[PDB]
Design a protein around this ligand. Sequence first.
Ligand SMILES: CCCCCCCCCCCCCCCCCC(=O)OC[C@H](COP(=O)(O)OCCN)OC(=O)CCCCCCCCCCCCCCCCC
Ligand SMILES: NC(=O)C1=CN([C@@H]2O[C@H](COP(=O)(O)OP(=O)(O)OC[C@H]3O[C@@H](n4cnc5c(N)ncnc54)[C@H](OP(=O)(O)O)[C@@H]3O)[C@@H](O)[C@H]2O)C=CC1
Ligand code: SF4
Ligand code: SF4
Ligand code: SF4
Ligand SMILES: [Zn+2]
Lengths: 114, 144, 206, 154, 94, 95, 176, 292
Amino acid sequence: TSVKPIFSRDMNEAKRRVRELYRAWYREVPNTVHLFQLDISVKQGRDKVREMFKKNAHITDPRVVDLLVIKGKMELEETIKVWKQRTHVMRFFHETEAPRPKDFLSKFYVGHDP
Amino acid sequence: ELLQVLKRGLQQVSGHGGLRGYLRVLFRANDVRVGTLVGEDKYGNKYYEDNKQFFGRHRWVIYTTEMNGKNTFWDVDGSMVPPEWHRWLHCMTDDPPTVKPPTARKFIWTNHKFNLSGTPQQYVPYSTTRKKIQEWVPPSTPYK
Amino acid sequence: RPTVRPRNDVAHKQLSAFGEYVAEILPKYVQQVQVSCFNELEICIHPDGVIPVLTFLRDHSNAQFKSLADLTAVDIPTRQNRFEIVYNLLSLRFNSRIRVKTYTDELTPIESSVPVYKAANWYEREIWDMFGVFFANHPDLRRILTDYGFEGHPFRKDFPLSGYVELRYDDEVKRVVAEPVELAQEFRKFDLNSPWEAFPAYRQPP
Amino acid sequence: GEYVVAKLDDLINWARRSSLWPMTFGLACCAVEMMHMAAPRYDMDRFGVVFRASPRQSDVMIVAGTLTNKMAPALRKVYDQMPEPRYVVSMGSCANGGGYYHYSYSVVRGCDRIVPVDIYVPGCPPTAEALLYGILQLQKKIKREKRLRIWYRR
Amino acid sequence: ASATRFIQWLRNWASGRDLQAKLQLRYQEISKRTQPPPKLPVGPSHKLSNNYYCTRDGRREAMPPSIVMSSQKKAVSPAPPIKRWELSQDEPYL
Amino acid sequence: GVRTSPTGEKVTHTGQVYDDGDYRKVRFVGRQKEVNENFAIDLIAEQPVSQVGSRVISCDGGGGALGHPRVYINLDKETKTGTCGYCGLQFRQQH
Amino acid sequence: TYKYVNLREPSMDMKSVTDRAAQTLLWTELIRGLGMTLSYLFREPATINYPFEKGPLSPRFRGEHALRRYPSGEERCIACKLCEAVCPAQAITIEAEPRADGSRRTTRYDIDMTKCIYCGFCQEACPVDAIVEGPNFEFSTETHEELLYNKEKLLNNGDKWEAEIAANIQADYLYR
Amino acid sequence: LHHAVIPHGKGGRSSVSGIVATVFGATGFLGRYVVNHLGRMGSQVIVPHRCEPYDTMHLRPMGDLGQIIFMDWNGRDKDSIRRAVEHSSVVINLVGREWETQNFDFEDVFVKIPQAIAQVSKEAGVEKFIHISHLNADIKSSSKYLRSKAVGEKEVRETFPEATIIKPAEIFGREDRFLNYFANIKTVKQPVYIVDVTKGIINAIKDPDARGKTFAFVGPSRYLLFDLVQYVFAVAHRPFTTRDKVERIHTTDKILPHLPGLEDLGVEATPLELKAIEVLRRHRTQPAKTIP
Ligand SMILES: CCCCCCCCCCCCCCCCCC(=O)OC[C@H](COP(=O)(O)OCCN)OC(=O)CCCCCCCCCCCCCCCCC
Ligand SMILES: NC(=O)C1=CN([C@@H]2O[C@H](COP(=O)(O)OP(=O)(O)OC[C@H]3O[C@@H](n4cnc5c(N)ncnc54)[C@H](OP(=O)(O)O)[C@@H]3O)[C@@H](O)[C@H]2O)C=CC1
Ligand code: SF4
Ligand code: SF4
Ligand code: SF4
Ligand SMILES: [Zn+2]
């Protein structure tokens, strides 16, 4: 079960990198909302950031966590340096996607998909 | 030589049938050269050639002023050239349809049409296949 | 024989001899050496050997492979290490080419070869972008070809040809938006393979 | 009175179609053939179509090549900065409907998903002459415009 | 080709070249747009005998790579050193 | 063999026509339905049967290399004619 | 074999140094450039008078597609689907069934002209010269939908253009 | 359901919603949002237009190939209305002008034209009819705009009894003549967001219980006109028109408790405070007090 590490040698070190990334994202949201002239609140921007972290809470592989942080840092670099445009930043919010039905009956009415 | 240049200019007014005909082609086609008439198609387009001109200017068409009920005095269109003359005008062949006429077929359009985009005669796509699944039709009479 | 490509035995021997030469000098890393029937020399190495093997081929006096022609990856999902990393090098001094191949999986970094060849910089970014292979100690590893915020690595065999999202302009929000991809005409998959074996010389033992 | 409105439409229509200043997005292959339309054989300038115009003095955008997802936002921004009246000519299969990259994950399947399009020039690429035919077809479209006639009838 | 003698002299002197010998515009020297039909030749496999496909089948002569070492003396270079190029005798220097 | 439906829409040579309740015919309002009037099925039927004096004839569709792949048609049955599978021309063995 | 493009040593004799000084101060090489553009001013332009004059083309030109017929009027297409298989862009969509007289014919033959790359592979693949790229290149439209050709449109193109198409095939078939 | 109009897909651009809609007045403020939401889910949209085709160009990207169809029409020509509606399953009327013209007065846009659309739609067999009226419509209003809206609202209910009638308050949005109107310069107002009104219209098309009903679309908060105009200037970072228009702006927004609203169509009203900056950002070179 011996593998080559990416950065972290265990989950404790991986979690430290996660918290540093979260802090960097949390502090950058107010600037992003201003520079990109977004129509969302800073609270919405930070709520979205927290949502994105939370969905990955179950990972226990430090290598997977390392890659998630690597990708998170690249995403933050694109935002901070304004490589993204307004459309790229707003793609986290799916503003034109009408909500898909979730309960069995609503999905049964509209189509065949599970 | 300058005098000879000017007389050639004046021979273009007479070569076009006088001042009015000279001005018609000048304003219709922005060109007053006089060439040899190679032929005319059933729509009234006239085809000319002058082999002393450089390749590409040695053949030209003076479009008809009316085609398929459309006033084309000012509104000319490259799609107005019928296929038989299309080959000659684009130098895909040497000799015109007056010398080597196309092979006749019964199904070939007798009346050429130009680009019809933007008119009520424009093409509108649609599926050419018939319905695949036939639904069950319930009986007309009542019986529950 | 006018239609058959002629063989070149002189080049086949030279490359075979140099293949042994390389494998004798770097036994720590070389796992396999082979020469193709059209005379291309391939060195297969353990991924640890990337920097030492490339440095030797660049700097050694009987190698002098000073030019990195290309660096790419191939995705082979059936393998435990699905990604094959391919270095194509050119030696102007000896008018010869060589190919070096190693392997990695999704979670195992490869050492960046920018220290050996500065040309490797953008190639490794492209491999990261298209395949998701992470290169360690890269001066600036980030996407290079895909759109900003693009998710996934399109050149993986299990990434769909048309992707997952498509763009359009939306008037209500006055910007370009991304939405799940729907196609008016689905791409039509073709099953073209003949059920009769073509090349007996490559038949795999059953 | 309606005679006056008919002739002013003719005047402003004639001016606009006689002075079409294009902005070309030379995105890919098709840009080469628009260069050949500017080149001496066809000389688009002789129709009043200046060779290159800045986006803010432009009247027609020519989308000449493949529009990727990465480039689509930039193209929309340029269209939104064009002073009106403005027209869009889609040139080549890629811009028309995605063409040979229609099934790609990174390609917009036709620039009409991003901007409205007035003329579609088919071909991969359309010849310089085919593009010139499309430009002259856009001129005829402008000739049909009746902005003042319709204004007078509101 | 229609330029007057004076204009030919003028644009020749201005350019420094004899432009009339190498005009950019094409005239009658181009090939006729209608040509006699071809009759193309056939390849070396167009024979009625001594022509079995197994004797001229390139694809079936391809072989898998030769393995010179697997994980199952004089030094050499990948090829002889390249030879020094020779300066052109047509025109060594612009 | 072009005919119109009760709605007046022309039926194509493939038998296509939108039925009464199909909204899709709105696409033709103010424009037109492209229909080719030269029905191949009727044009081929107008061709006469060729009388030949052998059990087997060949057809390449005419024009040699400009026609179709050359096929051989068996004429042993007198019940019907031999039809070319490519171009639809018909052949009959004489007496 | 190689040659040097820019390996020359300027002469330092006073006559040559003064030659370069005169060029620097009198702009002589700039004047020489003016002569070249002047000589073009008096050359005949290469422009042709489109649409009254057309750029030359060959019989091989790949333009708008069309479906062809035999001389009797029967369709040449037998729904073999080789064109659809080879099409690099999957621009061709075909459906087929036995015709009322039992003939093997298509019920759908669509070409998405905005997917097509005008490569001509379909007309190479066709065994009966049914689908061709014709000589027309002036068919730009005002709407996207107008470039989604179905069988009726393609048959109409064949009837419209056959006179020219047949002559072009006649001039090039011996090269195929 | 005719086979052609059975829904298919996942509700995206290339899907088939099964809606075939004729939208009169599609080239205006409300129309561009309605057509967008119809084309988002793959509906067939027929757009009759009176204006130049150049002025309908912004609608073309809103639907997949073939889904947006344009037609000429004249408000006074019933044959041109019949052409536009005889294949549709729903007709939406968004025709209106905020001012009168030499050729069309308020009695034309708000009575004669809506009645003709309703009558021809009834004759052609159209199942559903959605007619936009006004919250403050009233035959005793000081506004000739609002008096006509009441007369026409009654004639549509009589002519096409199953019509769904929608009565919006002042609508604000990027292209509105409300927030923009103040920025370009006693009474309580309850303005409603454009996207809310659009969603209500779309959900009325689908809801079968909406047939024959009359809805009032209002925003979540009531504001004094003075407090609203003050807020607009603050948001626009600015230091703080016909006669009929002024009367409308000063008409207090009616409170019709008996009518169903946006919550009866599954739509949550959007507060002005969330969207005001979106509309007013371009005007740049403390939330408003609300009535309990
Ligand atoms: C008895 C004694 C009497 C005493 C008085 C004697 C005086 C006579 C001797 C003086 C003669 C001096 C001539 C003055 C002209 C200016 C010369 C000059 O400035 O040339 C140098 C300048 C730059 O040259 P450069 O190659 O860059 O190198 C120099 C720096 N290292 O080069 C340039 O300026 C290049 C200019 C670039 C722009 C080119 C575009 C113009 C080309 C066409 C111009 C045609 C001339 C126009 C004529 C005027 C019309 C009215
Ligand atoms: N926006 C609001 O604040 C509210 C609006 N409403 C109603 O909603 C509907 C639309 O609102 P809005 O979209 O803002 O109105 P707009 O003025 O923005 O658009 C009006 C539409 O009506 C068309 N139209 C006007 N007069 C005529 C005519 N004589 N013949 C044909 N077509 C005509 C216009 O077409 P053209 O472009 O050709 O003029 C335009 O498409 C109207 O009925 C309006 O009264 C109700 C309550 C609030
Ligand atoms: S349409 Fe053809 S020529 Fe134009 S960019 Fe696309 S592939 Fe290249
Ligand atoms: S020309 Fe090429 S891309 Fe177009 S339909 Fe034929 S095979 Fe397909
Ligand atoms: S057009 Fe030719 S290749 Fe295509 S299906 Fe018909 S016969 Fe076959
Ligand atoms: Zn046959």
